Write a protein that binds this ligand. Structure first.
Ligand SMILES: CN(C)CCCOc1ccc(-c2cc(NCCCn3cccn3)nc(S(C)(=O)=O)n2)cc1
Length: 105
């Protein structure tokens, strides 16, 4: 499974996404005042602060579980927003960055 060395890598990946200029819509759980009907559209929300809590609590047993949470952030964004939205493009850019960082493992 995941070792403590693995978790050091997970935290570094998470921090690199949190510092990215296009991560700002994903840093915290969506405030419904920022996204009308968001929680009527998105049935399984996820955000980077929730992922940080899960990393710190050693919630993940496998790398696939960490990657699934991250992918949910991007999939939720592209489902909720039209493809010409700046928010949708944030997900496209940040997922490309994330997938490249994952190759470093
Ligand atoms: C005041 N607040 C606590 C903190 C300051 C503002 O923080 C945010 C965070 C996320 C959004 C936002 C929006 C949106 N779709 C657009 C909905 C309509 N809209 C257009 C512009 C603003 N709202 N999709 C998404 S996402 C998570 O699917 O990419 N995230 C917006 C603001």
């Amino acid at each position: 499974p995941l070792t403590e060395k693995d978790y050091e890598g997970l935290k570094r990946v998470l921090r690199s996404l949190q510092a990215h200029k296009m991560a700002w819509p994903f840093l915290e759980p969506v405030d419904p005042n920022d996204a009308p009907d968001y929680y009527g559209v998105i049935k399984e929300p996820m955000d980077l602060a929730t992922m940080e809590e899960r990393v710190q609590r050693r919630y993940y047993e496998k790398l696939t579980e960490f990657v699934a949470d991250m992918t949910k952030i991007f999939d939720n964004c592209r489902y909720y927003n039209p493809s010409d939205s700046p928010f949708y493009q944030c997900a496209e850019v940040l997922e490309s960055f994330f997938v490249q960082k994952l190759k470093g493992f």
